[PDB]
């Protein structure tokens, strides 16, 4: 064989070049700065109304509204300041495992195992929430719908491919292929020019929304990656997988910067989200709880103690005021 | 504060709607249909009457949702937990493929998949309704194909009853959580319309068992 040898040798030289150019670890530089100590967080508000496992959530752009997807085929919009149910959207398919909120607040797209990403229009002259368009063309279970603007949304799916859509026309404008495993999450860059996605092949890949070429790839995880999000400046991102390790990568360093694992943790990570200042990384774990790590010291500076079931989703507001958490116990808790 | 009060009242009305919808959804039976693909699950879904398929049917004033998810073509580890809490798992195994192969024969693959589903972490209190397909075909085939082809440790005549009992016992033995849940085996019939009746009886048994467990008396 020839192709196998070429791929193996190319991997060899790129690995050697990346290893040789490593100067020092993140801790080696950032050890000097003082730590954060103990961070006390308490459930300011608690949200009731879901009657099944909550699989995903997404904060509004005004940092006051919420959206939650649960196994009972319900989509609720929460007034987080007053814990009021703004909207309740009966989904056509009850097998939802991800969904998000439009940056303009006009739309919500929410879908799952039925291989359909439904778009919902909130601001209707009819007074209710109607389905805008159903995006079809994925052959595997869906994950991490993410609006770019009012008329284009990028989604990942269990058929090893991500896609950029065009809600006006409904056809898959651009296709992102290359994953050798089910892609489980994707996070949009703050600039909405790039994004990253983690897959079940224990790899994360950086993709360009306009050209659709594989710009960069990241390794280091041993199991399937289920959570990922960008650093607030758009120059780094953290991944979480089932091997109970969170890792911070830099898009320009092209190699892992830091590991966020401890011996006590045995279960993997379900959700990952960052604080506004880019220092406090929140990670919701499989067992029952979330851990609030210092994104520079790799030290667990606080734990969110609630959620008598597995926590599935996290969200940090744009203004950074609070952190909303959703768990399989059908309860959303705001911590501030 | 008048607008806030009206918002709270609208929230309360929405919440009563969700409560009523939960009441409606709590009195319906959830079955997860599983098999090896070529196990004649199509005959089953026909007798009851891409991505995930729901089959809805009412029998004896009981509403049944059955989820056929065999066409996912994805790792089961990532989406099986979405069914943790179904009333029952309807498993289907063909009896004709004891000698037929897909390497190895298909019956051993079915046994492995059944062991994986039954001993799955997320299914501890979820009961299984087991169906055995191709009754007449299996009875006819053993007349010339000995069962020693599939199982070399078998010791019995090439009769329908002994082989069927041996297969049922072999499926039973893979279960190791015998004290919490059990396997409810049935042999499929064509014109009796008894598969639906057996499913109804098994789900009724499961419902009564959950009630007794909740009441603390059991």
């Amino acid at each position: 064989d020839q192709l196998r040898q070429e791929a193996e040798q190319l991997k060899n030289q790129i690995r050697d070049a990346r290893k040789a150019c490593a100067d020092a670890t993140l801790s080696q530089i950032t050890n000097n700065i003082d730590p954060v100590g103990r961070i006390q967080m308490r459930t300011r508000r608690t949200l009731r109304g879901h009657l099944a496992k909550i699989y995903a959530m997404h904060w509004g752009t005004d940092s006051r509204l919420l959206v939650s997807a649960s196994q009972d085929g319900k989509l609720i919009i929460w007034d987080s300041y007053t814990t009021n149910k703004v909207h309740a959207i009966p989904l056509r398919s009850s097998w939802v495992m991800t969904c998000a909120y439009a940056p303009s607040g006009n739309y919500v797209a929410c879908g799952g195992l039925d291989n359909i990403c439904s778009i919902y229009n909130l601001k209707t002259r009819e007074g209710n929430v109607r389905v805008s368009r159903e995006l079809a063309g994925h052959t595997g279970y869906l994950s991490c719908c993410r609006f770019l603007d009012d008329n284009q949304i990028v989604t990942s799916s269990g058929d090893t491919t991500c896609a950029l859509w065009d809600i006006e026309t409904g056809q898959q404008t651009t296709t992102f292929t290359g994953h050798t495993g089910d892609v489980m999450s994707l996070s949009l860059a703050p600039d909405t020019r790039l994004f990253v996605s983690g897959a079940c092949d224990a790899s994360a890949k950086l993709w360009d929304v306009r050209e659709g070429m594989c710009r960069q790839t990241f390794t280091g995880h041993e199991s399937d990656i289920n959570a990922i999000c960008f650093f607030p400046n758009g120059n780094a991102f953290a991944t979480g997988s089932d091997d109970a390790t969170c890792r911070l990568f830099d898009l320009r360093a092209d190699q892992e910067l830091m590991t966020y694992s401890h011996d006590n943790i045995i279960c993997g990570i379900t959700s990952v989200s960052f604080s506004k200042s880019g220092r406090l990384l929140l990670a919701g774990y499989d067992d029952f709880n979330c851990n609030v790590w210092d994104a520079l010291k790799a030290d667990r500076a606080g734990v969110l103690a609630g959620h008598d079931n597995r926590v599935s989703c996290l969200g940090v507001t744009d203004d950074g005021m609070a952190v909303a958490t959703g768990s399989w116990d059908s309860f959303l808790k705001i911590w501030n | 504060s008048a607008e806030d009060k009206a918002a709270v009242e609208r929230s309360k009305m929405i919440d009563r709607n969700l409560r009523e919808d939960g009441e409606k959804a709590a009195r319906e039976v959830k079955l997860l249909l599983l098999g090896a693909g070529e196990s004649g699950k199509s005959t089953i879904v026909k007798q009851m009457k891409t991505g995930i398929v729901e089959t809805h049917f009412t029998f004896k004033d009981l509403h049944f949702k059955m989820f056929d998810v065999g066409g996912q073509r994805s790792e089961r580890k990532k989406w099986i937990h979405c069914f943790e809490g179904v009333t029952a798992i309807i498993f289907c195994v063909a009896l004709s493929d004891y000698d037929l192969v897909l390497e190895m024969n298909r019956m051993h693959e079915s046994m492995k998949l059944f062991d994986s589903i039954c001993n799955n972490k997320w299914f501890t209190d979820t009961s299984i309704i087991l169906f055995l397909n191709k009754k007449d075909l299996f009875e006819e085939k053993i007349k010339k194909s000995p069962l020693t082809i599939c199982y070399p440790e078998y010791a019995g005549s090439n009769t329908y009853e002994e082989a069927a009992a041996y297969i049922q016992c072999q499926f039973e033995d893979l279960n190791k959580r015998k004290d919490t849940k059990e396997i409810y085996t049935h042999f499929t019939c064509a014109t009796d319309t008894k598969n639906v009746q057996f499913v109804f009886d098994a789900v009724t048994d499961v419902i009564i068992k959950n009630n007794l467990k909740d009441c603390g008396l059991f």
Partner: single-chain antibody
Amino acid sequence: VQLVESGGGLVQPGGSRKLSCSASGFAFSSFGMHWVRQAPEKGLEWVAYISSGSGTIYYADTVKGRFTISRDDPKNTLFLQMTSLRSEDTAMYYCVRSIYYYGSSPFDFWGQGTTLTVSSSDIVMTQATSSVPVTPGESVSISCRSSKSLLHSNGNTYLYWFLQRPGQSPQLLIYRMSNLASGVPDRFSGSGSGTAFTLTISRLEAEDVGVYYCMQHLEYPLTFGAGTKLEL
């Protein structure tokens, strides 16, 4: 969206009539409904309000105990029942919808209304003038003042600006200070503080003439302004 009213006409005093409002084109069961009235060239005056599902019911001080507000959600129709009618009840009645949640425009659509003629604490808002001439292309500033400070502790002040063109029904323009309604041109803008409220129009056109009204919610009952008429 279309709200159609019926039941008006000429009635002897002390008699009884019933006003019906037929809704067709929106989710009626999720919208609270107001009955508002406008006397002949006097001004708008709130009459009644019934919430979604008839959970909450509010009446005006001047009429409480004489009218009956009714809802038929199955049929998407609104009712207003009248027992005793004086000479002050002669007015055009408008059936208005209102939905309340975080960010809604709770006076979006006004019905066309019907006329009813009869044979012969509260926050007060005042507008300074009643006739302002202006040429199109000239910016126009209007203002009104209230007694109480409508700025609630929530952070938003509950002030509403409506426009009524000659021969037409009112159109919602502003619902707090600067949040424009849906389908309204950008040229309108509003601001103010506490009690003093101003509405500015840049590059006015001939179709922007009519009578402007400023109203407060903040509390029930709802009170309107005097109404200022522009001329051209």
